Amino acid sequence: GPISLVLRLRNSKKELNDIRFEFTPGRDTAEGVSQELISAGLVDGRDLVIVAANLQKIVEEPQSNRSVTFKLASGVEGSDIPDDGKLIGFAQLSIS
């Protein structure tokens, strides 16, 4: 690190966005940065655990894990059926 990351997920208008951010191993934690995403209103609070888990995955081996796609707890029943293709009820973390 530092690691240049992108969180890709739909906003409240269902528009796809790429959120760019740095993660510095030794200084930042997956839980801490996930909480930052939530406090910024970029990620739903229900998604803390899954986003933290996937952030940890991508940061520990950024050489292996170029991309991780994961379910959103917030999207499990929310009016649109989850679709990983389409990143509906899913998000994706990737190396820039």
Partner: peptide
């Protein structure tokens, strides 16, 4: 400051 959408 962390994030750029």
């Amino acid at each position: 400051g962390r994030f750029q959408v």
